[PDB]
Amino acid sequence: ATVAVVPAAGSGERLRAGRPKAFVTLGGTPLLEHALSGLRASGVIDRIVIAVPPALTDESKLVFGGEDSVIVSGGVDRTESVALALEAAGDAEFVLVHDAARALTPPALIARVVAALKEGHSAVVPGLAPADTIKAVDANGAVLGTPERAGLRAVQTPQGFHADVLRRAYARATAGGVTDDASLVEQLGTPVQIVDGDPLAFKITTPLDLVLAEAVLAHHH
Template sequence: MVPAAGRGERLGPGAPKALRELGGVPLLVHAVRALARSRAVGLVVVAAPADGVAEVVALLDGHGLDGKKDVRVVAGGATRQESVRLGLAAIPEDVEIVLVHDAARPLVPVEVVDAVAAAVRAGAPAVVPAVPLADTVKRVEPNPGRPEPVLDTPERATLRAVQTPQGFDRATLVEVHAKALAEEAAGGADAVPVTDDAGLVERYGGTVVVVPGHEEAFKVTRPLDLVLAEAVLARRRAADDY
């Protein structure tokens, strides 16, 4: 599943982030192709902007995706959590493993997709790919625009930068989203949206495990990320690897 209903304003004004182009092809198309390359993936569900479903269908069809794998496009929601819930509803009940992938991670290698799916198949209820951090990290007292006091320095060896696709036992993912929706409706303090689905599993006491990610599975969030992605894509194409 690819939730792609957001706008991604940090890339600047213009088209939604998922529709920005990388090497002449929208990020969303790259992300769907990345999932579809895996033999573990039989269906890709895209949660598109509610007013852009027809546009996304035409976009995917125009890039030769129809017929190669089952790709379905549904209307997403106002938040990432809502888009994932709506995407889940479009997945057949007999599908037991669900991968959730950011449209803004267009270059994730197929071996990462395979590793996440394999870990869920082996019994993990929730799996995230991740890479060690290269930089020292400081925890601060937030004070945007002004000097921020350092609270402490976490041990870098225990930290990981999480990527996608994240993989889940379907029942686990459905359960945590149902709990989050119920809390949201009740106005609970814990109803603040988390930034990834694994965070929901953690919130409700579930187990999440990490498998190795890849440096090329980075998220395209800012203009400089797009420059780096173009360089990676050019190298792959030169090596006939894409």
């Protein structure tokens, strides 16, 4: 079985809409509901735990809450929100951590991440070739190097894990700042396997990204 943990507790500062980003609409439906729909449509998710902004917990339990759909208060940062949500994950052998902000993630991608876990990988992350050339820079913006593009991946969510591995990794988390779950698992020396991602699993962060997402939804309508 697979449980999805959905961090949806951020304030959406960069989205500029005056409300937490999970509750901004896309085609008239909140981003959170899009993310939940993708998870349910994949057919491979047995349980969902959603971390929401703390003040909205009670209202969220009423709107989004249900038997296989558990609301928890989120934390100060994404790492804390995921840690809190893991307390409610239950006994599923696999955990997928999926940003509510990646609202148009295709159910296909979710299914592929679970399939790779079931195959035997302990940690599975979707990734794509970076669209732009990546350069390493120093603190003043001077280029230090241009890593080989073929060996880089821009990663997305859901990031999938054997549950025991993810719990171990989060039990070692310190201070936060990290918003990539795989990084915590890498610190245990657990192998992390990249699988093909999907350009539609982009993270909605700014008003431009929402314009883009509206365009995608309208084009696939």
